[PDB]
Symmetry: C3
Subunit: 458 residues, 3 copies
């Protein structure tokens, strides 16, 4: 009797799970929204520099209109190798945000110290790996909360808390190839192993070296650490990057997971549109909404407010096929990256609508309980849209100078709705709905043309 | 000199042969239609229950319009494993009929007894395998005839005869996890091996156990049996499920095989339409035509009559892009499962045309020599349409409560054209073309709304 | 720590390189056009017979409109095996021209003799391999020049010189399974190894046998020869057909390589159109342009003239979406195979435009310095268009009786623009723009209907 080889089965549930972390794939939580959960772990925030400039350059005529295709190939080639190192070292990629990602090693507290050593080693192997593009890495460790929010058809998650805020601080202060440890990371870690320098005006710290003691054996140390990693592929599945590669069809799980993924993506997953259709350099409008709270680490207070905000944002965006691309925590606050003009979703009057939608969101969210300040940046132009990451873990994302600009506007011009010149000039609206603003110098943007506040009709 | 690995070549002839059994792939028969051939073998008729109810439920809004996609994934996941067991045990899957299949082990008579033991073991391993869904299995053994019929562009085949009628009886009388043997099966089999119970009002029989004698070794027994299996993958190809995976391009064979497969399928095979396009929950009209004969086991009489009927049915269906989905033998008669509204084939006035086409078929076929009774059931609604089975053996099929309803109407209301309420209400036709019928209780249907006879214009 | 298997990555740069030889993939030459380079090597020109007749026959109704699909499958099945033998024996496939290909073994002069023995052995293994279709093979050895020409968006290359002219002569004089060696090939080769016959009225020669001396061991001899093959897959990559299978994304290289490949092909490479869309039997018009020179082996003279011609041809074709399918050297001259009606590029008035474009090209090119004679054949009808070759090395090509006819017209009616009856009858133009020509018997065409010269408006 023959025993023929099982072919890899590439079921839709497996393709959907590529878009999600293990935290969600194997999470099985309740129905209620907001849902919150609490744990400890180590975070790695890996940021690549030089890609939005490449994006700008790949719009140039030398790429003969294969700009999007060439950009995504070279981006995925580099990012895939980072993703693979993270997975092999036992991390869960939580989210891609443009050309950056955030990864988690969830463990019990007693194991944090040993796991911090695993993540440092991983970081230094990634730095190793590095077209003129650098990588900055922040690491943090401690308490983390997860929030899941949404409605009957859509779900979103976020991590929140002091380690989350720390990991962004640590990354922001890194020079152009540094691994920086949060102060808490630095004090929980195994100091006899790691050689650091102080850094100016902060107790956060820079890693120079991993100097293991005499007969420390990393492979034995790692194996010990795997005892505490729930989903590390092993045994018969040790040749796989992710256990989620082995998920089997299960309608109830697939219904829960698909809510996290955008419809146009699901369509490609179902072999109902060409795989190449979602990689594009297209003109869109970014509406970047920032919500700040009294205490942004306190998930039981902020969770309800984010749910409330999401219910309203989703309904006004729907009126324009606008879409939420991603949600995440910034140093200040919860940010919704919203996009008008995603593929097949091109209403004309995009700019006008982007502005009215932004005002509506600003007015509603301002009155939501616990939301201290709302800030919204609106910028318009040619951005890269596409699937970024590795075949086994990847997400739909947007990269471009205009995405960066909208993000910086909401930070540098808090408490108001701001817009760029393309949006101002291109909108239908009367000029006195706007106020021209003082020019501010902003991190990693040059030649923002004039900026405007969208005042509305006083 | 390098010896690089041959890549699996997935030629169109290989993809076409996935849709056909070995009986046809390696058959090489004459041109004439009808063609008949005679042999012996064992049949297994495996029926899954619970799928048309799942079909109904997957139309619900909780599946967020990925109903068809989720249904086909979970159906193929389970059905694939059954297909694989059948192939590994050396069977030929002849046909899929909704959520049921029919499999054949063709052998010389002297070998029937030993082969019956192989098929029982296979059946019990399939029962093993079993969302709330059961499997019933009928087995039969003895004489089988095959009929091939059609025209210059289309071919169809059917198995006919006493073992065929038996295998349906045996399956129909099974409780909700039984393996039932036909009476002839029971008397040809190796009684010292198999432990049965009698069943009420029949000499057909239920298998409880396979109790091999002391040093019976199944693997050695199976290998002996493979001597009599012409196409069992072996040698260099022993890691394959089917020898048809190794077919090489051959224009003459491919022209003969493609006649059995629907054009829209061929289009996907040729990479001229998206693979996902044929999995759908769509509104269609089922026209189920049943032909009964004096003697339905006598292939030399009935073959000409089925050919004649097919020539006419095909021409009237063509006038409406109606399509024959499948043909097979029921307990009484030869059934054509015809469908109006298959993809890209959506004439409006579908219902009216379904009725006129049915009357035309009824009038012509009634006068064909040797056809004793014609019965036709017409039902309309949302049915699943798609490719069911395993990657190496699969077929386009329709599953749904309306498919079941049309099948039961033609059996419970013999000799007339019947239709459901959707068809009656939705058609263009005047009310006095119909007669409202007495309500009958019918196997595995509830809430058939009112039923009508299509009388035509007296 | 796991070491999971790297998946084959099928990056766009790798798919583009399938369309090109190593001579271009690993060439890295300057920007300037024309670019010329000089080397030595052995050429093999493998011609299949019987395919354009199969093409004709696959338009017949017996193929049920899957003619193109069946033709390409059976063509690629046979051609793939030839390609594979050529690659395994260390050759570079330079170009496909319908159902023929040209392959190169580039080496230093001292190694030519040993390499000639490798190529003969390869030839005899290919002859081995051979629906009623024969293979003729010409071999030549010596000096070869390569010309690269084009503009900012498109590149083309050609090999030129005495070995190139020789390899076509040798192939043209072969009977219907011969391997013929050019005279220069015959005198550089290892005469103690190869058993030949003379052939009528030529010092070119026919191979009967390879009779290696007593303890000649071909595998050891081949390995020695691999020392001189720059890109022979080896080591970790010895299970690959081509080293180009390992190319990694690199925007600068990909921009240079994509210029050689047609846009519609790039679109399929980018997963923006169905793979099956480019295999078709479609009506097109072939415009075959032949340029002759005083000395066609002298690349420093002819290179500028071909560049000049190309700049003009490309601009007039653009005005009609006409396309250059391929360029190559014929026994006399440089030929541009141009096509009107490639997919998505179907202007009506195709025939008229094909004629005016041809006249324009004829008038301009006639005055280009160093171009002695221009000849252009225009023929219209159903031709096969599609990707021919092996998965790792393949090209878009056209095959058909009309392609052959246009090629023969430009040779048998030199110095003028000629057209077939379909073109004459179907064009819009007044009858006195044409002159009906004397009927000539032409190699491998029968029933060319009447032929005409396109005179233009005197
Ligand atoms: N797709 C995305 N998702 C979330 N945030 C994004 C984003 N694209 C841009 N941003 C935000 O825009 C800001 C850009 O500033 P930086 O991160 O310092 C740019 P950089 O990494 O030095 O080089 P780059 O522009 O080549 O990416 C960040 O705050 C980042 O969070
Ligand atoms: N695609 C198909 N091809 C052929 N016959 C079909 C069919 N779909 C339904 N039928 C017919 O419809 C009838 C349905 O009755 P049953 O077979 O008893 C239903 P069941 O198996 O108990 O559960 P189910 O409805 O979940 O399938 C059968 O006679 C069957 O032949
Ligand atoms: N796609 C293509 N590219 C370049 N030249 C082509 C071509 N198709 C046809 N030709 C030319 O047309 C002519 C055809 O004549 P032959 O090569 O003798 C035909 P054959 O090989 O005996 O059988 P065939 O017609 O089945 O191919 C050749 O000069 C060839 O160069
Ligand atoms: O990674 S969470 O802040 O979206
Ligand atoms: O399996 S045969 O009755 O179509
Ligand atoms: O092979 S070169 O003459 O195009
Ligand atoms: Ca960045
Ligand atoms: Ca069933
Ligand atoms: Ca040829």
């Amino acid at each position: 009797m023959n025993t023929p080889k099982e072919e890899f089965q590439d079921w839709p549930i497996v393709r959907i799970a590529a878009h999600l972390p293990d935290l969600i794939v194997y999470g099985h939580f309740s129905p209620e929204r907001p849902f919150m959960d609490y744990f400890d772990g180590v975070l790695m925030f890996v940021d690549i520099s030089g890609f939005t400039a490449m994006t700008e350059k790949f719009s140039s005529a030398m790429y003969m209109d294969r700009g999007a295709e060439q950009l995504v190939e070279i981006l995925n080639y580099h990012i895939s190798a980072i993703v693979e190192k993270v997975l092999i070292f036992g991390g869960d990629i939580l989210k891609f945000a443009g050309d950056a990602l955030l990864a988690l090693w969830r463990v019990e507290r007693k194991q944090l110290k040993n796991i911090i050593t695993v993540v440092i080693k991983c970081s230094l192997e990634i730095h190793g790996l590095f077209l003129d593009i650098r990588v900055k890495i922040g690491l943090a460790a401690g308490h983390i909360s997860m929030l899941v929010f949404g409605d009957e058809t859509h779900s979103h998650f976020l991590v929140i808390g002091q380690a989350v805020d720390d990991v962004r601080l640590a990354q922001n202060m890194a020079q152009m190839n540094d691994v920086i440890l949060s102060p808490n990371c630095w004090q929980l870690c195994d100091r006899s192993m790691i050689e650091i320098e102080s850094v100016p005006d902060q107790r956060a710290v820079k890693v120079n070296f991993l100097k293991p003691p005499p007969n420390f054996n990393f492979d034995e140390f790692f194996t010990k650490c795997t005892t505490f990693m729930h989903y590390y592929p092993s045994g018969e599945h040790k040749n796989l990057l992710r256990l989620a590669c082995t998920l089997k069809p299960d309608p109830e799980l697939e219904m829960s997971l698909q809510k996290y993924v955008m419809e146009s993506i699901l369509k490609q997953i179902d072999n109902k549109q060409l795989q190449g259709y979602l990689s594009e350099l297209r003109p869109v409008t970014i509406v970047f909404v920032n919500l700040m709270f009294e205490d942004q680490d306190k998930a039981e207070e902020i969770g309800p407010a984010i749910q409330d905000a999401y219910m309203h944002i989703t309904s006004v965006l729907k009126i324009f096929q606008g879409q939420i691309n991603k949600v995440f925590m910034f140093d200040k606050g919860c940010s919704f990256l919203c996009v008008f003009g995603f593929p097949g979703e091109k209403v004309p009057d995009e700019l006008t609508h982007a502005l009215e939608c932004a005002m509506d969101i600003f007015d509603f969210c301002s009155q939501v309980h616990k939301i201290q300040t709302v800030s919204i940046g609106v910028a318009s132009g040619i951005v890269f849209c596409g699937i970024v990451g590795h075949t086994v873990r990847h997400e739909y994302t947007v990269i471009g100078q205009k995405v960066n600009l909208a993000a910086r506007m909401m930070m540098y011009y808090p408490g108001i709705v701001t817009c760029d010149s393309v949006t101002y000039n291109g909108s239908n609206l009367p000029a006195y709905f706007f106020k021209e603003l003082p020019k501010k110098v902003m991190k990693g943007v040059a030649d923002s043309g004039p900026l405007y506040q969208y005042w509305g009709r006083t």
